[PDB]
Design brief:
Chain F: This is Thioredoxin-like protein 4A. This is part of a larger assembly, with 7 protein chains of 7 kinds. Chain A is mainly α and 50 residues long. Chain A has 1 helix and no strands. Helix content of chain A is 18%, strand content 0%. The chains are: A mainly alpha (50), B mainly alpha (48), C mainly alpha (80), D alpha+beta (123), E alpha+beta (106), F alpha/beta (141), G mainly alpha (75). Chains in contact: A-F, B-F, C-D, C-E, F-G. Chain C binds one RNA strand of 42 nucleotides through helix 1 and helix 2.
RNA sequence: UUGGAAAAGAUUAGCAUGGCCCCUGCGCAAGGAUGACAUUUU
């Protein structure tokens, strides 16, 4: 089967209900704080462990 | 998302890196001038 | 088969929702009814309207007084 | 049809037969399949067996008349397996169905009338 | 209250097309919708003192049966140089938002 | 000897560009016996039915169709130009000119992403899109 | 109709035709005046070039025949 | 009140219709058990 034509979404224009479950599957309520951050000044780990 | 969109989404941190180190990368000592002023903006961009 | 009953019902209902939204799209009527004492007093009058419309759709199509009689007759009177 | 398919239900009788088989599918009195009809004939819980004359080869259900003579059960052949299969609530062709006895179920009068009618067909 | 809304109405239905190319479409839109539903009136909003097109346009159709097929077929259809986007006309004038404000408090 | 279709005069090329309303007309301007055009046509053939939902690929001989030589500046062995709805889609590849490809890329995924970029930026309306890679350096290490 | 009938505008000189010595392939002439005396003249000049290549013609053409034969024999 | 000079429309989110199931009511189809002492209306 060929690649689908790369159209974007029309879009999600309605919200809540099904759509919160649609994101609760995979893009759910994350930490949204101190897991997506790097903390500019400090080094919290040992320096080049990565 | 498409392979090209995944490529661009992974080049986003290169954008924030380049914008971060812009005052020392976009100077005239670093790239000898072919000083192109940015359009409708007073920024000169030494080097493409 | 029961899967075909589900498919036939769901496609008849899909064209029913499609033609009701079609009649909204033409603009004949505003859309139907979507569903501290004042707000649920409004929605109490509207759910009274909703239960009343259910009793209206049961009030017509009711086998009034003698359609029961003719259907009991065509049940009991065979084709001798 | 097949001459060994005997007795063969005519159109009015097979309409009543398929409606009774449909009602027995609804009332869970129906066992579809030649092996399940063979089982409910062996267990003696079968009211009557319908079969399909357009089963190729026919002999994969022609043991069922003999079982219906060793169990005293009425048997009758419907014209085609596709109509019988749809009358069992499945889209696949079913060649042999067993309408079975249940505890005082409401189809017993219809089943008795169809039993008296399809024991008139073998004549 | 602009004195120009009264040229389409005969209790007929208006489709709203927007995202249209401002370099053209003055009568291109009429040309495209013309096959559907016999001579009709279709305007394009080109604002004055400039001669520039503001985007959107209003095509008034005779039937809401005609409207559904027209809308479904010409949604995103290449017209002049931008794909048209289609919605239903607002016409939120005085005599309906007075009714809307009266329906707010009820 | 390709399974890709060929256009043999200026009318076939201009009507092949005007034929498509929702797909990128990918046109290779070059000669089939050229090694650069042979590798580029191998890349275009290996993706021709991948990108068929949003592109079409045409080969054009420069000797057979020489009228686009001056306007499109077809002076390199292969050029690959991209059109969408009669508009010539330029691409900032990093090569210095944006109008054509003008070399044979060996990665078929890079050609898929270039066509996909041209499609995304052309349905959005840009006449110039930016390639999702910089082809100024050959990235050999 | 030309390539302008597309509604197009620009934004054999191909590099396959180019060569760093000899310039572009293809001759500038071959049109414009070829006649009686032009044909007799290039008969004379082609005899002169053939005569100049008659110096080593046996050994050169023998070497070229042997080299293309063994080049087709090997690869 | 009067005179006058001057993104090719995005993203995030809530409700409802939609799906499903149970039950109730109505209908459609088939049932089940039972109770009752041609002359005159032009």
């Amino acid at each position: 089967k060929p690649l689908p034509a790369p159209l974007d979404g029309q879009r999600k224009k309605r919200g809540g209900r099904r759509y919160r479950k649609m994101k609760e599957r995979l893009g759910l309520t994350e930490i949204r704080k101190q897991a997506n951050r790097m903390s500019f000044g400090e080094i919290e780990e040992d320096a080049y462990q990565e | 998302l498409t392979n090209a969109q995944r490529s661009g989404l992974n080049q986003i941190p290169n954008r924030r890196f380049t914008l971060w180190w812009s005052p020392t990368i976009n100077r005239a000592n670093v790239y000898v001038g072919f000083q192109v002023q940015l359009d409708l903006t007073g920024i000169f961009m030494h080097g493409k | 088969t029961k899967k075909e009953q589900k498919k036939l019902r769901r496609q008849t209902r899909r064209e029913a929702q499609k033609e009701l939204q079609e009649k909204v799209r033409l603009g004949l009527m505003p859309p139907p009814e979507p569903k501290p004492t004042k707000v649920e007093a409004h929605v109490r009058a509207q759910m009274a309207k909703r239960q009343k419309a259910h009793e209206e759709a049961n009030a017509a199509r009711k086998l009034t007084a003698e359609q029961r009689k003719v259907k009991k007759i065509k049940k009991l009177k065979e084709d001798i | 049809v097949n001459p060994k398919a005997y007795p063969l239900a005519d159109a009015h009788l097979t309409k009543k037969l398929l409606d009774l088989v449909q009602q027995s599918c609804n009332y869970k009195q129906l066992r579809k399949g030649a092996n399940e009809a063979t089982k409910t004939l062996n267990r003696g819980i079968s009211e009557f067996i319908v079969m399909a004359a357009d089963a190729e080869p026919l002999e994969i259900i022609l043991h069922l008349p003999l079982l219906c003579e060793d169990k005293n059960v009425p048997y009758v052949f419907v014209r085609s397996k596709q109509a019988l299969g749809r009358a069992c609530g499945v889209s696949r062709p079913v060649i042999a169905c067993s309408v079975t006895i249940k505890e005082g179920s409401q189809l017993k009068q219809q089943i008795q009338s169809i039993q008296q009618s399809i024991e008139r067909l073998l004549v | 209250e602009d004195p120009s809304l009264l040229e389409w109405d005969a209790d007929d239905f208006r489709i709203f097309c927007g995202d249209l190319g401002n370099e053209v479409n003055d009568d291109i839109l009429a040309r495209a919708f013309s096959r559907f539903p016999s001579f009709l009136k279709a305007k394009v909003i080109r604002d004055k003192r400039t001669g520039k097109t503001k985007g959107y346009g209003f095509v008034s159709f005779k039937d809401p049966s005609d409207y559904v097929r027209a809308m479904r077929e010409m949604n995103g259809k290449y017209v002049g140089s931008r794909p048209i986007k289609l919605r239903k006309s607002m016409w939120k004038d005085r005599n309906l938002d007075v009714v809307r404000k009266k329906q707010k408090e009820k | 000897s390709y399974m890709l279709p060929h256009l043999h005069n200026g009318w076939q090329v201009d009507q092949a560009i005007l034929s498509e309303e929702d797909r990128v007309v990918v046109i290779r301007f070059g000669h089939d016996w050229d090694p650069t055009c042979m590798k580029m046509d191998e890349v275009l053939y290996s993706i021709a039915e991948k990108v068929k939902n949003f592109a079409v690929i045409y080969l054009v001989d420069i000797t057979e169709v020489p009228d686009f030589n001056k306007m499109y500046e077809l002076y390199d062995p292969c050029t690959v130009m991209f059109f969408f709805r009669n508009k010539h889609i330029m691409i900032d590849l990093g090569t210095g000119n944006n109008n054509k490809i003008n070399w044979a890329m060996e990665d078929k995924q890079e050609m898929v992403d270039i066509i996909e970029t041209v499609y995304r930026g052309a349905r959005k309306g840009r006449g110039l899109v930016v390639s999702p890679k910089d082809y100024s350096t050959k990235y050999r290490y | 109709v030309p390539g302008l009938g597309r509604g197009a505008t620009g934004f054999d000189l191909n590099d396959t035709n180019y060569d760093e010595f000899n310039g572009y392939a293809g001759s500038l002439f071959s049109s414009g005046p070829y006649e009686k005396d032009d044909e007799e003249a290039d008969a004379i000049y082609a005899a002169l070039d053939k005569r100049m290549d008659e110096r080593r013609k046996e050994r050169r053409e023998q070497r070229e025949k042997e080299e293309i034969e063994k080049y087709r024999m090997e690869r």
